[PDB]
From Swiss-Prot, chain H:
SMART domains reported for this sequence: CYCLIN (SM00385)
Subunit record text: Found in a ternary complex with TATA box-bound TBP. Part of a TFIID-containing RNA polymerase II pre-initiation complex (PIC) that is composed of TBP and at least GTF2A1, GTF2A2, GTF2E1, GTF2E2, GTF2F1, GTF2H2, GTF2H3, GTF2H4, GTF2H5, GTF2B, TCEA1, ERCC2, ERCC3, TAF1, TAF2, TAF3, TAF4, TAF5, TAF6, TAF7, TAF8, TAF9, TAF10, TAF11, TAF12 and TAF13. Associates with TFIID-TFIIA (DA complex) to form TFIID-TFIIA-TFIIB (DAB complex), which is then recognized by RNA polymerase II (Pol II). Found in a RNA polymerase II initiation complex. (Microbial infection) Interacts with HIV-1 Vpr.
Domain free text: The TFIIB-type zinc-binding domain is necessary for the interaction and recruitment of RNA polymerase II to the core promoter, the formation of a fully competent pre-initiation complex (PIC) assembly and basal transcription initiation. The C-terminus is necessary and sufficient for interaction with the TATA box-bound TBP complex and for the formation of PIC.
Region called Necessary for TATA box-bound TBP complex formation, residue ranges: 180-252
Catalytic activity: L-lysyl-[protein] + acetyl-CoA = N(6)-acetyl-L-lysyl-[protein] + CoA + H(+)
Residues annotated for Zn(2+) binding in this entry: C2, H5, C21, C24
Name by which UniProt lists this protein: Transcription initiation factor IIB
Region of interest (Core promoter DNA-binding), residue spans: 125-129, 185-188, 219-222
Zinc finger TFIIB-type: from-to: 1-29
Source species: Homo sapiens
Length: 49, 44, 98, 48, 134, 64, 48, 252, 48, 49
């Protein structure tokens, strides 16, 4: 991610040249369920957190 | 003060104040242009 | 044939193509020297400046060797005159540095 | 040369500046030595 | 056993072969430097230091440096030369230039300027030195 | 990187025999026949072409 | 901008900067051997 | 203090780390330079609260992949503000979030308040309050944001091609120069210029997609677009390739 | 050329040493410094 | 022989435990305060990165 925040695929040569760390963004799907003792459950899924 | 964009090899003049970003390609790797000074090599 | 005089060498020499490798150990990377170079201000002892002039450690083995040699004058020079020559004024009555 | 009462610190000796010097680093910043740092606390607690 | 100079694992080499490129090699040393504004009181920047700008400067000439504070490729360098002119603001400004060692003598092969992982202006200077068998 | 201009051992010019040598190999000559055809009598000169590795052809694959 | 007397960096303890001399020794950074300061303890302390 | 030549600039020499009389050669000082030191060639509550602020800044900054130079700059802004204490009553999370916005502005890579709000628990409102207070507390100011500062991020986040991003940049700048969007927020103009440029290209994006990434309501985009739409042929670059002609762009 | 030995000036080497002094560091063999009777050190490369 | 896989899997297991530990602490503080918590804010991407 450049200073301006634009993501760009990092080539290994750029990583060696610019002293970057050649890393892959890791995402996980998370499902949040909440119960408020009111015989009801709310289930929400945070995709690719 | 000319720098050569490492990607598109396009020479661009950059001052002390402006960023390194390539004028056309936006690439951020710039190589200084070869010196105009005369360097002599004895062919030994 | 001997290159200097051209006379044949009495023994025949074994000669042929052999693969050789040049190792990364160049002499220019290992040559270093030190003569009254920079010193650490706290320790007042040799240290590298803008070269490899850090000096050689005159360790226990060199001291013990010079002791066996009996070169007490050289032993003193290496371990004192050549590293951190210093002098102080001391009180004869209280033995403390004055 | 040695006395039992001298084993009690009634006055503290402060080492010379050369034993605990303040080096100049990254400009004019006087980087004080570890002893000077503790000497600052000693005098603060002493005054307190 | 030609004249004894090869004794005890030593080797004698053909000077004319070495002169023809036998085992000749090139040694490349890459010097990296960055300008970082960590701490608002300190601001290091690449620029050729000048007498009126620095309260104290050594007699080593900075004439090899360009207006951007970096030496250009194709310039010969030695331990007496400065490859990078960096200066930091004092709370006059101090000079924190990057010198080569007295043993380091070569030619600047390449000088690239970029923004490193930290986003700070960064550069690498590769110095080329030809190692002839000796 | 590239074919030596002179044979290290004896100085015979070999820097002009590389494309000739490769041309002969394409013409199905064996390495021994090709070196003979080029006039590389000494094993020191033969060692130059027979053992050369033309990496410059590989370095030219990267854009300037 | 200058060292203070009776402070941790009291100029009598030694040379303050390489381009100076302590008033007690009148000698340079290397010539001056350094001198000890002292802190009178408001209460005696056991020497560890 | 030259013994020989007073009022002489003694020359510092690295060969031995000493100073020499510049007009005699007499060596003054034994080896006082320490050339290697010159050129290489349990916690206070105030510090603890600052440490927590730093951990908060690095956390918020990492969520948006802000570079470390911006974090250092932010930490220096926070130290000055925290030491100035005119915001001593404000929560450190608000000060840090406001400091992060200022650092991005000072660095020329502005993040909208909604973006900084999205990574911090503090609302835009409280961030806005601490922001203005900090500028006064620091007695400084930040350059006014421009439509071109967001094009790179929004277009990249929208996966828009380079020419679309350039067209959007030209469209937004020209719309501001032509004053077609008076008083509109630059984000709204940027989003509208991106919408126009996107719709003119093969890579078509909806107002919701652009709205979600730019942080602008589709209504605000629609209004801002409606103001610039009549001048669309003048706003696009002369050297642009239209997949959908400017005269046929969506009218609403 | 880098390492040195301090030769005491005697009427027997005064002339030989005078030669090495004028040669200095630029020409090998030469001399790096002169130590006067006062104990002061003079670098010949600064004022040859 | 513990190669790059078994070695990195051992770290990621420890770094993930810390991530979940950190999410519990953050979410629990907000739940105790009686307010919902934003899952996207609880996660400290610095732990794994
Ligand atoms: Zn480019
Ligand atoms: Zn006494
Ligand atoms: Zn041959
Ligand atoms: Zn003194
Ligand atoms: Zn003088």
């Amino acid at each position: 991610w450049e200073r301006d925040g634009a993501p760009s695929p990092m080539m290994p040569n750029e990583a060696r040249l610019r002293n970057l760390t050649y890393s892959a963004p890791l995402y996980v799907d998370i499902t949040k369920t909440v119960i408020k003792e009111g015989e009801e459950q709310l289930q929400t899924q945070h995709q690719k957190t | 003060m000319i720098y050569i964009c490492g990607e598109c090899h396009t020479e661009n003049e950059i001052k002390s104040r402006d960023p390194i970003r390539c004028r056309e390609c936006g690439y951020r790797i710039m190589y200084k242009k070869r010196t105009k000074r005369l360097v002599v090599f004895d062919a030994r | 044939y001997n290159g200097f005089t051209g006379r044949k060498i009495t023994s025949q020499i074994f000669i042929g193509p052999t693969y050789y490798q040049r190792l990364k150990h160049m002499v220019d990377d290992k040559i270093h020297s030190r003569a009254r170079g920079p010193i650490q201000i706290l320790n007042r002892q040799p240290m590298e400046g803008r070269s490899r002039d850090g000096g050689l450690r005159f360790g226990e083995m060199e001291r013990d060797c010079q002791i066996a040699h009996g070169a007490a004058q050289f032993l003193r020079e290496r371990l004192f005159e050549a590293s951190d020559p210093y002098q102080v004024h001391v009180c004869n009555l209280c033995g403390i540095m004055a | 040369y040695a006395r039992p009462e001298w084993m009690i610190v009634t006055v503290l000796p402060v080492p010379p500046l050369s034993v605990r010097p303040a080096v100049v680093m990254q400009g004019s910043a006087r980087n004080q030595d570890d002893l000077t740092h503790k000497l600052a606390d000693i005098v603060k607690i002493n005054n307190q | 056993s030609y004249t004894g100079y090869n004794q005890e694992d030593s080797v004698i080499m053909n000077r004319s072969a070495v002169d023809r490129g036998f085992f000749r090699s090139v040694f490349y040393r890459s010097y990296k430097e960055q300008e970082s504004k960590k701490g608002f009181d300190q601001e290091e920047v690449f620029e050729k230091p000048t007498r009126e700008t620095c309260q104290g400067m050594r007699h080593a000439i900075y004439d090899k440096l360009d207006d951007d504070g970096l030496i250009a490729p194709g310039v010969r360098v030695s331990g007496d030369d400065v490859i990078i002119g960096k200066t930091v603001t004092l709370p006059t400004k101090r000079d924190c230039s990057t010198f080569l060692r007295t043993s380091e003598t070569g030619i600047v092969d390449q000088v690239m300027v970029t923004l490193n992982q930290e986003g700070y202006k960064f550069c690498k200077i590769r110095v080329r030195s030809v190692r002839i068998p000796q | 990187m590239i074919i030596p201009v002179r044979c290290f051992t004896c100085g015979k010019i070999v820097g002009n025999k590389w494309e000739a040598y490769l041309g002969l190999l394409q013409a199905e000559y064996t390495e021994g026949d090709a070196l003979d055809a080029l006039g590389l009598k000494r094993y020191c000169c033969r060692r130059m072409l027979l053992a050369h590795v033309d990496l410059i052809e590989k370095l030219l694959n990267y854009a300037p | 901008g200058r060292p203070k007397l009776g402070g941790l960096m009291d100029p009598r303890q030694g040379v303050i900067e390489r381009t100076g001399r302590c008033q007690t020794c009148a000698g340079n950074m290397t010539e001056c051997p350094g001198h000890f300061g002292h802190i009178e303890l408001a209460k005696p302390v056991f020497h560890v | 203090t030259c013994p020989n030549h007073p009022d002489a600039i003694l020359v510092e020499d690295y060969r031995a780390g000493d100073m020499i009389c510049p007009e005699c050669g007499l060596v003054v000082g034994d080896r006082v330079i320490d050339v290697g030191s010159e050129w290489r060639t349990t916690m206070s509550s105030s510090d603890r609260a600052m440490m927590n602020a730093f951990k908060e800044i690095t956390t918020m900054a990492d969520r948006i992949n802000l570079p470390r130079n911006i974090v250092d700059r932010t930490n220096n802004l926070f130290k000055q503000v925290y030491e100035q204490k005119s915001l001593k009553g404000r929560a450190n999370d608000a000060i840090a979030s406001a400091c992060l916005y200022i650092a991005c502005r000072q660095e020329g890579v502005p993040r909208t308040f909604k973006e900084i709000c999205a990574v911090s628990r503090i609302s835009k409102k409280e961030i806005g309050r601490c922001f203005k207070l900090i500028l006064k507390a620091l007695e400084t100011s930040v350059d006014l944001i421009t439509t071109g500062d967001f094009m790179s991020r929004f277009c990249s986040n929208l996966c828009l091609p380079k020419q679309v991003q350039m067209a959007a940049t030209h469209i937004a700048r020209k719309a501001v120069e032509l004053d077609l969007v008076p008083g509109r927020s630059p984000i709204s103009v940027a989003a509208a210029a991106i919408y126009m440029a996107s719709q003119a290209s093969a890579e078509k994006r909806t107002q919701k997609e652009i709205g979600d990434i730019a942080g602008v309501a589709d209504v605000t985009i629609r209004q801002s677009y409606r103001l610039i739409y009549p001048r669309a042929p003048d706003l696009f670059p002369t050297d642009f390739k239209f997949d959908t002609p400017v005269d046929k762009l969506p009218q609403l | 050329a880098n390492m040195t030995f301090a030769e005491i000036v005697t009427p027997f080497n005064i002339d030989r040493l005078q030669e090495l002094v004028r040669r200095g560091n630029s020409q090998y063999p030469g001399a790096k410094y002169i130590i006067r009777d006062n104990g002061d050190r003079i670098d010949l490369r600064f004022h040859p | 022989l513990d190669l790059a896989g078994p070695l990195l899997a051992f770290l990621f297991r420890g770094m993930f435990k810390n991530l979940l530990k950190e999410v519990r602490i953050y979410a629990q503080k907000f739940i105790d305060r009686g307010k919902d918590f934003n899952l996207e804010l609880a996660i400290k991407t610095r732990i794994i990165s």
